[PDB]
Design a protein around this ligand. Sequence first.
Ligand SMILES: C[As](C)(=O)[O-]
Ligand SMILES: [Zn+2]
Ligand SMILES: [Zn+2]
Ligand SMILES: [Zn+2]
Length: 151
Amino acid sequence: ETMLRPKGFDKLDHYFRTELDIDLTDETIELLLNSVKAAFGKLFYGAEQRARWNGRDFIALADLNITKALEEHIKNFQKIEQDMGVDELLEYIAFIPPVEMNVGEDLKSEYRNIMGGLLLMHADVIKKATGERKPSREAMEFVAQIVDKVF
Ligand SMILES: C[As](C)(=O)[O-]
Ligand SMILES: [Zn+2]
Ligand SMILES: [Zn+2]
Ligand SMILES: [Zn+2]
């Protein structure tokens, strides 16, 4: 790899291998990030309605479709000291939530924790579903499919 590899990939690659026992490639990182981005969009299911019922004109964290299981991953992510590239990866995915309403700035400030939780959740699913320390394209495509069915 060189310094041109998209920013964050480096650090994610390094964290997944050394701390989670998952060997990623550029190809499987892209698949992983597309699945994270998809799941992130799914968290906005019901969010505009919940915001309106609360008298708000913006989406708050309280309005998102986050479950207890994801909340646990988000909390575990916040206690990680090593930088796994989440800030760079967030910019890389160029996330646009599927809503017309304003996303509140305090929620925007939590996007790194949400994405970090989604990354740890995906690592958990990779290990429990693929059977491969170095997942193939098809293994990762399967992870994205089964993740889509819990969001
Ligand atoms: C030098 As590396 C991103 O393969 O840990
Ligand atoms: Zn590369
Ligand atoms: Zn590498
Ligand atoms: Zn395929």
